[PDB]
Amino acid sequence: HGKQFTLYTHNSGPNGWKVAIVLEELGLSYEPVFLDLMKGEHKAPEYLKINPNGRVPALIDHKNNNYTVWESNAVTQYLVDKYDNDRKISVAPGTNEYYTQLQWLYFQASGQGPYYGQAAWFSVYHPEKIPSAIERYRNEIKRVLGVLESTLSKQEWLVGNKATVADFSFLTWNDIAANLLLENFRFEEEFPATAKWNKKLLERPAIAKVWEEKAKAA
Amino acid sequence: HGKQFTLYTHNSGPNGWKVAIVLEELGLSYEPVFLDLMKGEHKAPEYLKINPNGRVPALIDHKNNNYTVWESNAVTQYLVDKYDNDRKISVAPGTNEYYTQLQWLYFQASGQGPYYGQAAWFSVYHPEKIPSAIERYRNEIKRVLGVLESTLSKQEWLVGNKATVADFSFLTWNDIAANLLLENFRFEEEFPATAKWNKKLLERPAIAKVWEEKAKAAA
Numbered sequence: 001h002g003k004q005f006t007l008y009t010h011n012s013g014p015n016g017w018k019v020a021i022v023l024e025e026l027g028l029s030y031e032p033v034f035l036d037l038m039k040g041e042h043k044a045p046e047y048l049k050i051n052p053n054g055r056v057p058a059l060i061d062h063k064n065n066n067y068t069v070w071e072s073n074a075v076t077q078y079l080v081d082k083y084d085n086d087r088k089i090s091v092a093p094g095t096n097e098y099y100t101q102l103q104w105l106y107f108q109a110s111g112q113g114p115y116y117g118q119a120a121w122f123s124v125y126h127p128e129k130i131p132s133a134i135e136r137y138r139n140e141i142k143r144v145l146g147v148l149e150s151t152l153s154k155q156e157w158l159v160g161n162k163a164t165v166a167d168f169s170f171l172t173w174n175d176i177a178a179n180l181l182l183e184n185f186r187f188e189e190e191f192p193a194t195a196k197w198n199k200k201l202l203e204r205p206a207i208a209k210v211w212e213e214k215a216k217a218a
Numbered sequence: 219h220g221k222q223f224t225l226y227t228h229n230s231g232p233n234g235w236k237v238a239i240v241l242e243e244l245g246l247s248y249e250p251v252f253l254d255l256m257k258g259e260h261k262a263p264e265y266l267k268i269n270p271n272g273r274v275p276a277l278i279d280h281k282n283n284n285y286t287v288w289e290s291n292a293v294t295q296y297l298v299d300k301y302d303n304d305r306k307i308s309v310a311p312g313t314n315e316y317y318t319q320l321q322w323l324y325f326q327a328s329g330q331g332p333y334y335g336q337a338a339w340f341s342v343y344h345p346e347k348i349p350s351a352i353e354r355y356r357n358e359i360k361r362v363l364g365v366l367e368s369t370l371s372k373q374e375w376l377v378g379n380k381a382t383v384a385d386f387s388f389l390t391w392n393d394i395a396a397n398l399l400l401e402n403f404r405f406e407e408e409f410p411a412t413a414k415w416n417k418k419l420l421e422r423p424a425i426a427k428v429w430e431e432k433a434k435a436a437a
C-alpha cells in the first residue's frame with residue numbers, strides 16, 4: 001500500500017502525540033516526519049507550503065489525493081469524521097452531539113493549549129523571569145482543570161457517553177502541566193474526577209502504546 | 219424573546235460580535251443578553267449551568283429544544299451547518315474543504331484569539347507593566363497577520379472561492395489589534411492583501427450592520 005498518512009511533527013510535542021493517539025486508535029497507517037524546530041525547519045519554505053503558519057503538526061492523506069490539513073484539532077476532526085465510521089472514538093456528524101464534541105475540542109484548542117503553553121513559555125523560554133506572568137498562567141491551568149472537574153464530577157465522559165477524541169484531546173497538555181509546569185501538585189487530591197478520567201484514558205491500549213513511545217522520545 | 223436564539227454576550231469582547239455577525243448573515247432572530255463581566259455575572263451559578271468555562275459567548279437554540287453550545291467557533295459551526303443550507307457563508311459538511319474551513323477556524327480560535335488576547339491583557343489589565351511581555355504578543359500579532367497575508371496574497375478567500383465564516387472569524391480581533399494593541403499601525407501599508415480582505419468583508423450589509431451596533435455599544 002504505502003502508509004496512508006504522513007504526519008509532520010517533532011520528536012515530542014503535545015499536539016503531534018495527540019494526533020498520533022487518534023491515528024493509533026483508528027488503526028490508521030502513518031509515517032511521522034520529525035521537523036527539527038531548533039534548526040528552524042518548520043519556518044523553511046518547503047514546510048510553509050504544507051502549513052503557512054509554520055507550526056506542527058500537519059497531516060497529508062495519501063489516499064485522498066494528498067489532501068493536506070493542519071491545526072491538530074482540525075486534523076483530528078478530519079480523521080474521525082472520515083475514518084471512524086464505527087464511531088469508536090467520536091460522535092456522528094450531523095447530530096446535535098457533534099457540536100458539543102466540537103465545543104470541547106475548541107475549549108482544548110483555545111482554552112487549554114495556548115494558556116498552558118504560555119506557562120511553559122514564561123517558565124522555560126522567556127529571556128527574563130517574570131513571577132507575575134508565571135503566576136498568571138499557573139492560575140489559568142488550575143482554572144481549566146476546574147472546568148473539566150465541574151463536568152467530569154457530574155458525568156463519566158465529556159460527550160457521547162463514551163470516551164472520545166474530546167476526552168483524548170486534553171491528555172498531552174495535562175501531562176505537561178502535572179509533570180513540569182505545576183509545583184507541589186497533587187492531581188488526585190485537587191481534581192479527583194479529572195485525575196481518574198486521565199488515568200482511565202491512559203489505560204486504553206492504543207493510548208498506553210503511544211504514551212510508551214512518548215516516554216521513549218525526548 | 220419570541221426570538222429563535224438567546225446569545226449570551228457582552229459589549230466589548232470580540233467573540234460575541236463574531237457570533238452576532240453569523241446570526242445576522244443567516245437572517246436568524248436572536249435576543250442578546252449582555253452580561254457584566256466586571257460584576258462577575260459570568261461566574262455566577264446560573265450562567266455556569268450554561269457554560270462551565272464561565273466565559274462568553276454561549277448560544278441557546280429555542281427551536282432545537284434549547285440546545286446549548288459555547289465556544290464562539292463551535293457556535294458558529296453549529297449555526298452554518300444547521301441553518302446555512304444554501305451555503306451562503308460556508309462550505310458543505312462532508313466535503314474535504316469543510317476541514318480546510320475548520321482548519322482556518324482553529325487557526326483563528328487558537329492562533330489569533332488567545333495570543334492577541336495576551337497582548338490585550340498585558341497592555342491593559344495586568345497590574346504591572348512588562349515591556350518584554352507586551353513586545354512578545356505584539357510580535358505574535360504581526361506574525362499571525364503575516365500568515366494571513368501569505369495566503370490572501372495568493373487567493374481571494376481562505377476557502378471555497380467565496381467569503382465564509384472562516385474569513386469572517388478574524389474580523390473582531392483584527393479590529394482590536396489594528397486600533398488598540400499595535401501602535402501606529404498602518405494596515406494597508408504593512409499587510410495590503412489582508413487589509414483589502416478586511417475592508418471588503420466590512421462592506422457586507424450584515425457585517426456593516428453589526429459593526430455599527432458594536433461601535434455604538436463601545437460608547
Ligand SMILES: N[C@@H](CCC(=O)N[C@@H](CSSC[C@H](NC(=O)CC[C@H](N)C(=O)O)C(=O)NCC(=O)O)C(=O)NCC(=O)O)C(=O)O
Pocket residue numbers: 013014015037042054055056057070071072073109112113114115116117118121328329
Ligand atoms: N494550535 C496549534 C498549536 C501547534 C503548536 O503550538 N506547535 C508548536 C510545537 S508544540 S510546543 C507548545 C507551543 N509553544 C511554542 O511553540 C513556543 C514557540 C512559539 N513560537 C512561541 O513563541 O510561543 C504552544 O504554546 N502551543 C500552543 C498550543 O498548543 O495550543 C510549534 O510548532 N512551535 C513552532 C513555532 O511556533 O515556532 C495546533 O494545535 O496544531
Ligand SMILES: N[C@@H](CCC(=O)N[C@@H](CSSC[C@H](NC(=O)CC[C@H](N)C(=O)O)C(=O)NCC(=O)O)C(=O)NCC(=O)O)C(=O)O
Pocket residue numbers: 110111230231232233255260272273274275288289290291327330331332333334335336338339
Ligand atoms: N475561546 C473562547 C474565548 C471566549 C472569551 O475569551 N470570552 C471573554 C470575553 S472577550 S475579552 C478577551 C479575552 N480576555 C479575557 O477574558 C481577560 C480575562 C481572562 N480571565 C484573562 O485572565 O485573560 C481573551 O483573551 N480571549 C481569548 C480569545 O478570545 O481567544 C470572557 O468571557 N472573559 C471572562 C473571564 O475570562 O473571566 C470563545 O471563542 O468563545
Ligand code: NA
Pocket residue numbers: 010012013014015016017056057
Ligand atoms: Na506539537
Ligand code: NA
Pocket residue numbers: 228230231232233234235274275
Ligand atoms: Na466575547
